[PDB]
Amino acid sequence: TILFQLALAALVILSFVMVIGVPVAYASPQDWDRSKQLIFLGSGLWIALVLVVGVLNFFV
Amino acid sequence: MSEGGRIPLWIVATVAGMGVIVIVGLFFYGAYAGLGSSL
Amino acid sequence: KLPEAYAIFDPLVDVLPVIPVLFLALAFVWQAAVGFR
C-alpha cells in the first residue's frame, strides 16, 4: 500500500508529540481538563495507528 | 549586563555537557575512521 | 536488515537503543533545574 510508509510516519510523529506532551500536561498547573481530553485522544489515536501499521504490515 | 543569573545554570550545564559528549563522540568516531583506524 | 518496507527507518532504528541512557542523563538535567534541593 506504501501509504503504510505514512501511517507509520504518522505513528512516529504522533509518538514524538506524546513523549513531550504527556509529561508536560501531567505536571502543568493550568488547563488540565483540556490537556486530559487531548491525552485520551492521543492515546486512542496511537493505539489505532499501531493496529493500522500492524495489519498493513502484511500488505507491504 | 554583567548581571549574573540571566541564563539559568542548569541550562548552561546541560548545553556545555552535551557539547562535551559531542566532541568526545567525534573522537571516538575518529578511532574507527581515517588515521588510527588500522584500516 | 529490517523488512524492506521499513528500510526508510534504518537511521532511527540505529539511535533507539541509546534512549534508556538518555533517561539517566535526564534525571540530572531535572535535578539541576530544581537546584539539587
Binding site: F16, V19, I20, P23, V24, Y26, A27, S28, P29, Q30 | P8, W10, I11, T14, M18 | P11, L12, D14, V15, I19, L22, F23, A25, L26, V29, W30, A33, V34
Partner: peptide, 28 residues
C-alpha cells in the same frame, strides 16, 4: 545526517520537557 538528526531531535526532547515545565512554573 539522517542519524545525527534523529539523535539531535530525540536528545533535545528530554531537556525540552524540563525547559517547558520550568517556563510555566510546572510541578518539577
Amino acid at each position: 545526517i539522517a542519524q545525527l538528526t534523529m539523535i539531535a531531535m530525540i536528545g533535545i526532547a528530554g531537556p525540552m520537557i524540563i525547559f517547558l515545565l520550568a517556563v510555566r512554573r510546572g510541578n518539577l
